[PDB]
Every structure is written in C-alpha cells, then in structure tokens.
Design an enzyme around this catalytic site. Structure first.
Site, PDB file in Angstrom:
ATOM      1  N   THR A  74       0.835  -1.193   0.000  1.00 56.35           N
ATOM      2  CA  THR A  74       0.000   0.000   0.000  1.00 56.35           C
ATOM      3  C   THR A  74       0.872   1.244   0.000  1.00 56.35           C
ATOM      4  OG1 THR A  74      -1.980   1.043   0.946  1.00 56.35           O
ATOM      5  CG2 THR A  74      -0.249   0.362   2.520  1.00 56.35           C
ATOM      6  N   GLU A 104      -3.988  -1.963   5.936  1.00 52.61           N
ATOM      7  CA  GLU A 104      -3.374  -2.308   7.220  1.00 52.61           C
ATOM      8  C   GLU A 104      -4.353  -2.924   8.211  1.00 52.61           C
ATOM      9  OE1 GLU A 104      -2.962   0.595   5.627  1.00 52.61           O
ATOM     10  OE2 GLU A 104      -0.916   1.377   5.754  1.00 52.61           O
ATOM     11  N   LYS A 112      -6.915  23.659   4.438  1.00 58.53           N
ATOM     12  CA  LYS A 112      -6.796  24.669   5.488  1.00 58.53           C
ATOM     13  C   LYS A 112      -6.961  26.049   4.871  1.00 58.53           C
ATOM     14  CE  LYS A 112      -4.998  25.149  10.064  1.00 58.53           C
ATOM     15  NZ  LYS A 112      -3.873  25.438  11.011  1.00 58.53           N
ATOM     16  N   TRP A 154      -9.914  24.242   9.447  1.00 57.98           N
ATOM     17  CA  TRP A 154      -9.951  23.092   8.548  1.00 57.98           C
ATOM     18  C   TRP A 154     -11.282  22.994   7.803  1.00 57.98           C
ATOM     19  CZ3 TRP A 154      -5.187  21.310   8.392  1.00 57.98           C
ATOM     20  CH2 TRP A 154      -4.387  21.359   9.539  1.00 57.98           C
TER      21      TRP A 154
HETATM   22  N1  LIG Z   1     -15.867   4.384   3.686  1.00 54.00           N
HETATM   23  C1  LIG Z   1     -14.761   5.281   3.517  1.00 54.00           C
HETATM   24  N2  LIG Z   1     -14.927   6.620   3.530  1.00 54.00           N
HETATM   25  C2  LIG Z   1     -13.911   7.475   3.373  1.00 54.00           C
HETATM   26  N3  LIG Z   1     -12.657   7.024   3.206  1.00 54.00           N
HETATM   27  C3  LIG Z   1     -12.421   5.692   3.186  1.00 54.00           C
HETATM   28  C4  LIG Z   1     -13.472   4.781   3.351  1.00 54.00           C
HETATM   29  N4  LIG Z   1     -12.963   3.522   3.310  1.00 54.00           N
HETATM   30  C5  LIG Z   1     -11.634   3.622   3.114  1.00 54.00           C
HETATM   31  N5  LIG Z   1     -11.316   4.941   3.039  1.00 54.00           N
HETATM   32  C6  LIG Z   1      -9.971   5.497   2.854  1.00 54.00           C
HETATM   33  O1  LIG Z   1      -9.145   4.489   2.319  1.00 54.00           O
HETATM   34  C7  LIG Z   1      -7.963   4.355   3.142  1.00 54.00           C
HETATM   35  C8  LIG Z   1      -7.390   2.975   2.966  1.00 54.00           C
HETATM   36  O2  LIG Z   1      -6.842   2.855   1.657  1.00 54.00           O
HETATM   37  P1  LIG Z   1      -6.347   1.461   1.060  1.00 54.00           P
HETATM   38  O3  LIG Z   1      -5.350   0.854   2.037  1.00 54.00           O
HETATM   39  O4  LIG Z   1      -5.633   1.793  -0.209  1.00 54.00           O
HETATM   40  O5  LIG Z   1      -7.561   0.673   0.743  1.00 54.00           O
HETATM   41  C9  LIG Z   1      -8.458   4.754   4.521  1.00 54.00           C
HETATM   42  O6  LIG Z   1      -7.431   5.051   5.457  1.00 54.00           O
HETATM   43  C10 LIG Z   1      -9.365   5.939   4.191  1.00 54.00           C
HETATM   44  O7  LIG Z   1      -8.609   7.123   3.960  1.00 54.00           O
END
Ligand SMILES: Nc1ncnc2c1ncn2[C@@H]1O[C@H](COP(=O)(O)O)[C@@H](O)[C@H]1O
Lengths: 533, 538
Positions: free
Chosen positions: B185, B330, B438, B443
C-alpha cells in the site's frame, strides 16, 4: 516467517470490555428471585464484573481456582461469568436440579473454593453443607438475610462482597489456553479455555449459525447453569445485543409476558419449556408480535413444534444440537441455497434434522471397527467430532486415553448426508446389531421389567453364528416366584416385532452393579459369551 | 492450569477444507479472459487448490516464499489464494494497474519466486521481465499458448503445472501466526510498503466479517466482489465466503456498468461489493435500461466515502440496503460497518436514514480512538475531530522488511485519517490528512463538500480539492462531471450548498471535466487534480 499483525490473546474479559465500550447503555433486563425486575445494561454489568473480580482476588484464591454457581439466568450470574473468568479463575456452572449426592460429588470433585447460589437453593445448600469440606466461601446472590444466616453459618452475601472490590481493577493477561470454565455432563467435567470459549462465540455469532445483532432482544431460557446457555452470554456481548434474563419464573405465562413486554426477537429454549410457552400463548391469543426466530436444542425438536412457530406466528425455528463436550454447539439447522428449488412442503421437512456444522467443527460416522462410512444420509454409524471447542480429555482424567485417532466419539449413532446434515438415530451402547435390523436393548428391557414376576432385567447383545448378534434376557426372578423362560418370552408377543424378541432367558441372583448404580453390561456379555452357540 | 480442549491452529486451508466438505456443490461463476464463463463450485476450487499447492511445493519453494499474482477475480485466482497460503507460502497479490516501474520495485522488494498472471497482462510482464531476476517461474493463468511462449521464453502454463501435483496432497500444519499473504500500500510518502498478514489474523477477520452487523455472508447469498482480489484481498470476501459456503460470481476483466448489471440479472446476485466509482456506472446503466435488479438485496460500499445520494438511490429505487464500511490495507481491511442499533428504530424515519450515512461502528476484535496533534486522547463526542488510531486482532504491527521502526504510538496504529467518534462508536471521516483543506486558519472537509455536490441531479460525480490563494493559503475548488444529458451552470451548483455548510466553506469556483482522474483502486487522484488546477484561483 511470522506475519506482522498485532497479536492479542482471545480472553473472555475482552468480550465484556467491548460491550461496555461500544454498547454500554444497551439494556439488560433481569428477573430477580424476590420478584423485582432489574433494568441494567452492558456497562453496569461490566463494572460490577470488574469489581467482583477484584473482590474475588482479595480473598487470596489461587489462579484457576474453581468458583461454583447454583444460579438462575440473572444479572448476578452474568456478572459472575465475567468476574470469575476475567480474573483468572474457573467459572464452574452447576446444575441446581441434580440430586443432593450428585451435587456433593460434583462440588467436591471440582474443588470449588467459592459457591455462589440463588435464594431458591438455600435449603438445598444448607442440607449438603456439612459434606462440602473444600468450600471456603458460601455466597448468597443477594443482600444480607437473617433467616439465611441462621440456615448456613457463616454465610456471606454477594451485595456486601462486591463492595470490597477496587473500582480501578484491571483484568490480568495470561495465555489464551488458560482454563476458563467447567461443566459436568458419575458425571464428567469438561474444562473449557478462554480460546475455545471465544472461538465458539465467534462461530455461534456468524449469520448462518445463530447470529446475534445489536437490534436483537435475546431471551435465553436455556440455563446459564448448564453448557454456557449455548454461548449466548458471550455472543450477545460481542454484538451488543439486548438481553432478557428470565430468572426462576419459567412457566408459560411468565415467558410469554416477557416476550410481549420487552419485545423479545430471539428466544432460546428446550422443547419442554416451549410446550408450556405455546400453551399459554394459544390460550390468551397473543401474536408474539416481536418474536422473529427461536433456537431449540438439548433434545430433539419435534417437527410439529417447528410447524406451529412457522404457521401460527411466522417464526423460524433453528433446531440445534450439541453437548457439554462441544461447548455445546455442534450443528444448527439452517438451509442451503439449492433447497429453495424444491417443493415447499419438502423444504419444511428439511428443517427437522439436527442441522449442519459450522466452520470450526467437523463430523463423521464410523463402523464398529472405527473406519469411515459414507455420508449418504442413510447409512448409520457412530458419530465422531473434532474442532476448536471439542474437548481433548475430561477434568482430572488426563491419563485415560479418550480420543480415537484424534476424534471424540459422541455416543450417538447418526446419519450424515453429503451436505453435513446430521440425524440422531440411536445411542451406540444401546444397539444390538442383528442381521436384518438393529435392535434397541432398552426397549426390550422396558418390556421385560414390567412382567409381574421379575424384580429387574437386563438385555444384552450376545454373539450368534448366523445373525452376528442377538439379544439375551438376563432376568432376576421377583421375590417368591419361579417364572419359566417360556412364559417370559411369550410376554413379548404383540409388544414388539417377534424377530426382535430375545432368543433365550438366563436367571441370576442380581445384576452386576456400579457404584453409580446402573448395570455393567460388559461383564454380562463376557459371562454369557456362548449362550446362543 | 490450562484448559483441556482440542487445540488446532487457525489455518486458511481449514477454510477451503470446510467449503469443500460441506458446500462442495455450491456454485461459483467465473468470467474468464478467453471470453467464456466457467461454472465451477467450492469442491472443484478446493481440489484444484490442493493440486496446485502440491505442484508449487514440488518446484522446491521454501516456507513462506512469496507467490505473486497479477490477475482479475476468477477461479484460478481463487485457487491460488488457497494453494499458496495452504501450502505454507505467502500469497502476494499485486495491483496490475500500477506503472511498470512500480511493479518492478514491488516484485523485487517482495522477492516473489513465482508470478502468476492473466493473459491481459502478458505484454506488461514481457516488458519488465528482464528486471524480475528473482522470479523463477512465470505462469500464464491458462493453457499452453505459442504466441505467449514467444513473448516470454520459458513461460509456464497453469493448466499444465497443476497436472504435476499429487492427487493426495496433505496441507502442511504450522503455527497460526505464520505469515500468509502480503499486500503493498502506497500513497504518501515514498515507496509502497508491505502488509504481511497471518493465518490467525485472516481467520479472525473472517469470523468478524461473517456476523450479522458487519457483512455476514450466507449460504443463501450470491456474492459478487467487484473490489479486486489485489485490493486487500477483495476485502476478505474469498475467505469469508469459504467460511459460509456462499455462492460467488467472479467478474473477470469487464467491470463497466453494463457488464455488472448483466452479471446481477443473469446469475441472480444478492450481495455486491466495491468502491463508489464502480457503482456510478452500474446505477447509470441500470436507469437507462430499466432493470429492477430484482435479485439484489444489499451492497457493501467502502474504500472512499459513499455519497449519501448513492445510499438513497439504492434504497428508494430498488429496495436495496447499502452498508457503508471503512477500513484499510493495514486492517485486513474491515474497520467499521454502518448497521443500526436497537434504539434507532423509534426515531423519525428521516433521521433513521441520516444515521446510515457515516462510516459505521466497530465489531468485536477492533478498537478506535482519536488523538490530538500532541497525541493525547480526545473526547468521543461526535463533534471534536482528531487523528484516528486503531488496534485489534487484524491490525498491522509493523510493515514488511521494516520491523525495526517504532511505528505504533502507545500500541496504536495511526490511520492517517481525520475523524469524529460519537458515544455510540460511529465514526465519521472528515478527510485524509493529506487531502484536508486549510483556509483562513480553520480546517475544511473536502469529503463533506464533494459529496454535497454529488447529490445534485445534474452532476454524475465531483471532487473538491484545495488550491492556493494569496489571502487564505488554500481555498476549495469544485471539480465537476456533468450528468449524461445535462448542462448545469456554475452558479446553480454553488447555490446547492446554501444552508448545508458554513458560508465561508462553500467552494469559490467550479471547473468542469469530462472525467475525474482515478488511482489504481478506483478512488480520486486528488494530487493530480491539485497540480492540474493550482492556478484556478490565481
Ligand atoms: N468508507 C470510507 N470513507 C472514506 N474514506 C475511506 C473509506 N474507506 C476507506 N477509506 C480510505 O481508504 C484508506 C485505505 O486505503 P487502502 O489501504 O488503499 O484501501 C483509509 O485510510 C481511508 O482514507
């Protein structure tokens, strides 16, 4: 190479911590022995569990000391579940309906250091108290009572004990295979771990097994005093389900009134208690409006009972099977996708068997030599099980060679179909395997003992050169009588198929007995090796 | 004193073994790259997985060597999941939408010894093959092909290699904390990092995902994961569906809206899962052709914030319940799921709908809290926002080949997300902290603004980013995609914000584009939009 995830033990105390952290105000209703109704919640139950765990710790008990309960389903039994296990002791649920000498055997064998009990059992505990040499603390699950203290010097009281606990108690950490709890089937003890308890909760909490939701109002009428109320005290904490704990009032009118007053959605019970519930329900006309589903286990669920819940109330019935040795759940009757393509009345029939196993348990049937038999749904054999919450050996009997090639024999003969659906057919020890059809020995004993000229009788399978195995009636003549073999055998005519009647009668002075009382059918078989050859 | 229960390790191979024993004939539909559809079942997948695990062991691979994949969701990818982990290797799913140069870095960092790949990626693999010097076996997920053998000399073929496997192979038994799988990731900052799962973490996550208030895969379900099997293992579904014996529809290469509608109607899908962008084309095509998607019961929408108007379209038009979910690579992935609580039933119907909009609440086995810039606890009051921290049985401890570092703060993992937490444990994403805006000393949530804009019927989709401004440092810009037949004016779009957000937070300007740039997992590439529009307000 190991993974790189956080690793924490699977501890029962983490279940109650989660419910208090994320479902703290979710309501629990508790019917007390004094006729009051306590309205509490996962948060109060957790804080009291912590406080009582500290209080128990300050009595000087050693790690994994046994803590016995003789208790109904109420808030204080639920606090003990988590106080005892979470603090590192063994939560020993005892069945308060056993005979007094059964309780003395069990309580002394487990070496309970503390005995919590509800007020219903005051006279029972007072009566056996003299024989309970190893109990250092008797604790009525209520406030100080002058009458109770007269019956049991020097009784202690739950509502004083819990005030000795520190408000800042922290749960100890230990190996997740640490012994957590104890339950007796002479009865034999099954000693659970935190790991097995939590995995069984996980499995039971999946959608296709039982599956508790935060939206449920769950009423366990199955007793917390035996096989862990089918895991519901743990599963409901993982999901933050509301609970209605029925206390001592288990007759139909009280149970129906609970369902309608608190909106029970999921009710868990055994066939005899439900018969009373359905009787009052039919009489008063209630629609049981909130009830969506019911779990019925512990004895074979009658098909017509399933039909009643379905056709009268629109309630789905989950037939479930298990035993103390399996924590208890082994199997649950939930359908498969393909069943929806069958005619509706055959879909109904599919719900009658004991059900399909979840992930974490495996089932098979074996022949008399222990070899696998086909899971075709019609061939019968001895049922064997294994998995994450099946026992490995009985308490204080580690040297006893229980498992057979890694599997636990349950004692039932069963059929299994290709999908894993299990049907209980008989008990392995009861079957005489005669050529054209198997015979139930207890059915023949029940005929024989009714004869006016027999004190008692036993029926055993004995070898036959043509039929493999045939029944032999070992009879004890009643006092002052000399019945002949011919008339005793003639007494079976019309009471059972004639080909099932025992081939011969032998008379003896008494039957070989066990200190348990029952018959040692083993030495019978040995002594009468050649009766029919 | 220990308990006296049978003690077995929690194994990924136990999942497939349970599916094969008790759900052997339950059907799995597999859309192949060769333009055909395979009808298979858990029993066949399991027998193939057993033979493939044997074949790989016969190559001489050592325990926990990495097995790489570049593949769609299909039967062979599912067989690899269990063949590699069951045999004691690390199943390493790789995203084939990354640049060739990123794949070289990932594949060499992970030291994959085998690279399985689908025919779509034959040119890709051939272009970078001479830089993959530690891969010992390149395996087309198919039968022998001469053209392919020409592109990659020494290429091997999945349908030949599986015939080298023993018919009676027994899975090895090993510690449940053994490494099982690996996903990389990235984002910020620097090179992507590897999450190394274990058999224990995988099975525990599977148990939790199969409860009623998270996902809860049923034997009655027909599950279609549009989320890729290289995106946190398709959100766990290949393990959760094996545990339950769910039916599966595996969509292969065609993930546009028309293909998805046809899969749902042809194979009766009941549960479907993917990121928001995937659902835009589905809903768009479904409205055009008039289907009622009769079999569809539920969706699981996560990976980016689900637009409130997407939940209401599924509910009002089809009677379909959307489960908004949040998690991370993670976190294996699942962190929270939005399912009601008992007390919500008595609220007015419109406030029940509104409570379904946030990212949900946590199941047993995972824990959430928010902390301020100095790292100290903040109140879970639903209004105060902070940096979201997590821990549990399926949360990462350290990244692959980086166990040295002090990654965790006080035993908690920092997500990088900014969030609120309410007393009932419902989490609301404010923003990725790399995306939060910002302006004038306070924010602004770009997630909040863009999903207000998405609700306007004249826009198909939109995103909000911060762009420089001489007075305010940053200001919000609305980047908008016009709906198919529509031509919204800029002014009518900014007025749609009135009374939904503070007046100073409304985007200052709207720019139209024909499509949003998307990253390799279907979320918006806001960094590219910030570079491309850095001057929209100067
Ligand atoms: N339902 C959700 N709403 C907003 N952001 C999300 C959501 N689910 C996952 N994310 C974002 O996706 C990240 C994980 O990315 P990834 O490891 O590439 O799948 C999280 O830390 C969030 O920033």
């Amino acid at each position: 190479m190991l993974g790189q995830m956080m690793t924490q033990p699977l501890l029962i105390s983490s279940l109650i911590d989660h419910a208090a952290r994320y479902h703290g105000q979710t309501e629990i209703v508790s019917v007390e022995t004094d006729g009051t109704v306590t309205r509490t919640n996962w948060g109060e139950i957790a804080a009291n569990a912590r406080r009582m765990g500290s209080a128990l710790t300050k009595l000087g008990l050693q790690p994994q000391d046994r803590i016995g309960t003789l208790a109904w389903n109420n808030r204080r039994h639920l606090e003990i579940y988590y106080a005892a296990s979470g603090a590192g002791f063994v939560c020993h649920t005892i069945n308060p309906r056993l005979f007094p000498e059964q309780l003395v055997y069990i309580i002394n064998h487990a070496q309970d250091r503390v005995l919590f009990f509800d007020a219903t059992f005051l006279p029972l505990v007072a009566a056996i108290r003299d024989q309970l040499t190893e109990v250092k603390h008797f604790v009525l699950m209520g406030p100080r009572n002058e009458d109770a203290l007269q019956q049991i010097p020097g009784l202690e009281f739950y509502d004083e004990l819990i005030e000795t606990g520190d408000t800042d108690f922290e749960w100890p950490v230990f190996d997740e295979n640490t012994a957590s709890s104890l339950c007796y089937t002479h009865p034999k003890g099954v000693l659970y771990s935190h790991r097995s308890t939590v995995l069984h909760s996980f499995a039971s909490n999946t959608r296709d097994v039982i599956g508790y939701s935060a939206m449920d109002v769950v009423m366990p009428v199955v007793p917390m005093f035996h096989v862990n109320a089918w895991g519901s005290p743990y599963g409901c904490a993982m999901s933050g389900a509301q609970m209605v704990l029925p206390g001592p009032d288990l007759h139909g009118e009280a149970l129906v009134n609970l369902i309608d007053t608190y909106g029970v959605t999921l009710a868990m019970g055994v066939p005899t208690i439900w018969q009373g519930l359905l009787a009052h329900a039919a009489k008063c006309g209630t629609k049981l409006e909130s009830l969506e589903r019911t779990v019925i286990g512990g004895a074979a669920c009658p098909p017509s009972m399933i039909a009643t819940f379905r056709e009268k109330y629109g309630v789905d019935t989950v037939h479930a099977w298990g035993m103390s040795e399996m924590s208890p759940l082994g199997t649950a009757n939930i359908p498969l996708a393909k069943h929806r393509k069958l005619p509706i009345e055959e879909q109904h029939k599919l719900r009658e068997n004991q059900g399909r196993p979840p992930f974490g348990v495996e089932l098979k049937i074996v022949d008399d030599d222990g070899n696998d038999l086909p899971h075709d749904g019609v061939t019968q054999g001895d049922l064997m099980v294994r998995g994450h919450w099946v026992l490995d050996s009985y308490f204080q009997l580690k040297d006893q060679e229980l498992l057979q090639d890694g599997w636990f024999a349950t004692g039932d003969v069963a059929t299994l179909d290709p999908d894993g659906y299990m049907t209980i057919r008989d008990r392995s020890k009861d079957i005489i395997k005669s050529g054209g059809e198997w015979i139930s020995s207890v059915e023949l004993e029940n005929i024989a003992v009714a004869h006016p000229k027999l004190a008692t009788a036993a029926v055993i399978g004995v070898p036959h050169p043509k039929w493999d195995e045939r029944p032999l009636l070992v009879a004890v003549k009643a006092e002052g009588e000399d019945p002949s073999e011919a008339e005793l055998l003639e007494f079976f005519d019309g009471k059972i198929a004639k080909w099932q009647v025992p081939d011969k009668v032998v008379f003896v002075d008494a039957l070989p007995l066990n200190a348990t009382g029952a018959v040692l059918k083993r030495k019978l078989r040995d002594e009468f090796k050649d009766a029919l050859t």
